[PDB]
Symmetry: D2
């Protein structure tokens, strides 16, 4: 469907900027038959660089000329049967930014907490097991919190944060839902 | 800050549609001094109905004339210490649609599952304890799934769904994150 | 669809979303549960801006999220308007509130008097209808350009700008579409 | 900022977001991990549309999410263009791709020949510059209106529309701004 989606979106955009096959073809150094072919679903072998040139001439992005991620749901639902190890939970092309994980935190030395520099999106966390020592903000003088099982947290986009199990408690587990 | 936010947004919108105090005042049956007062932060006693008239004359919504929810974060973070009972987890005015809950499911009779007709937003779920009998789609001939502890699910906006503990297992627990 | 009726429906949606019953919400607002139920029955019209801000606050959201969209002033999808600076306001619509089109008669031809607009929320398209325009933008050390009749321009959000007719040319006219 | 360079950065962001290393991602694409690392070093320019669709698929997202925005063709926030139907394309910008302004010369004055546009993704503002326009919209049982010089109109997304000059009036001219 990449080729098919591109074929449809290419035609819509070309029409939108009032170009006929010949007009777009000239700008790209192609023949109008070649542009007609792309709109007939034959664009599959176009390279990333060529797509960039086409988007440029059409004053838009490759993204605007390609289809959305797709649908992997079953009547609207998708299920997943069951120092840091990441256990990936269910994801879906219908909500690409959703990345939920069960994180096993195996280090219990807060001095050795390493900061993720911040995310582009928000994050919700729940302490599944053990006790977590969370740190955030400025790596040099961070905000901190000892979080027992059952505690929950929200971390806003771009806020640096790190986690370790509470000093000498061995290990802990968190569910992290980035969205 | 409702009054202060309104004062600033009102002035910006009025200016945007090229109205001076007198022009807006006439349309509302008010004096220009009264409109000037609102822009000086004195709009706190305006009623919901009056706000609706002001938004109408300015061709916009009450929402466009009022401030965003606000910031309740501490350097970008907010934490919460620890047939259906809802245990509300952390929420934040910085991401209003985020509503995470620990749901105790106390009914284990799938025949008695009642369908939530669907949400405006998406939902992620994780089976915390026990085994869940999930149903979704058409209440009369639903899709179903038996989900053991550790299973995860995603439910798209407006998809009806219901949950019960697996037949005769007593009770179960889920973390539901609506966003 | 009154302001009261829209609030009534959105208030109920949000209250249920955060799993509060009438009594729980009433306890946070200095009201009885019966009064909260009344609001949900369309009786919130007299609520003040200040009170609406508190309601939004305890529900962890904004007044905007609890009030209806601007409205629909269209006739099956369309709306038609018959026919130093004078602004002739063209058609506007509650279905696209940021759209503010204007025919601007520029009656000063002394660039030295161009007064800068601090920038807009939103983009802007301009088209010179008559005369010659002396345009200025950026840092009020501004960039400058002479725009003859038929010239068109795009100014991105927040870019400050100002204009007059070209020196000693008398007057000019342009159409400015903010969107 | 090449298409290759943008893809390189976004691919790496996404791969890390779903916690896959080079080897894990390589195993889903029929490539070696060294080749995946090369793409992240800017060497993906020859990747085909088909291959990009597969990459997006295994990463649970869209080609759009893995490719750069349209780009910036502005000069400190602005871009300027000097000066049956003939379309004179006015200024456009990659910073607002949906903006397509045009001066349309309408050379047919027989309403019977108005050919309907199935509707647009996006809104549209129109202003009659010369002559009289016979506008049609909705169900190609259409609504109709005569628009004299100076009239303005707004047509919402997806509403089909068509126009000619008013019967026997020769020709007309309008400016159409799609945004
Ligand atoms: Co994180
Ligand atoms: Co639900
Ligand atoms: Co402006
Ligand atoms: Co159109």
């Amino acid at each position: 469907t990449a080729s098919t989606g591109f074929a449809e979106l290419l035609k819509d955009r070309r029409e939108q900027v009032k170009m006929d096959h010949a007009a777009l073809a000239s700008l790209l150094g192609e023949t109008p038959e070649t542009v007609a072919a792309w709109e007939n679903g034959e664009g599959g072998e176009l390279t990333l660089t060529q797509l960039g040139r086409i988007a440029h001439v059409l004053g838009t992005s490759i993204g605007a000329l390609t289809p959305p991620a797709g649908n992997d749901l079953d009547d609207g639902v998708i299920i997943q049967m069951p120092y840091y190890v990441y256990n990936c939970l269910v994801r879906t092309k219908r909500a690409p930014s959703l990345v939920p994980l069960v994180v096993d935190v195996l280090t219990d030395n807060p001095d050795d907490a390493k900061f993720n520099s911040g995310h582009a999106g928000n994050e919700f966390l729940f302490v599944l097991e053990g006790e977590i020592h969370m740190k955030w903000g400025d790596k040099e003088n961070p905000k901190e919190a000892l979080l027992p099982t059952g505690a929950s947290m929200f971390v806003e986009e771009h806020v640096p944060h790190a986690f370790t199990a509470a000093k000498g408690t061995g290990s802990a587990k968190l569910i992290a839902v980035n969205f």
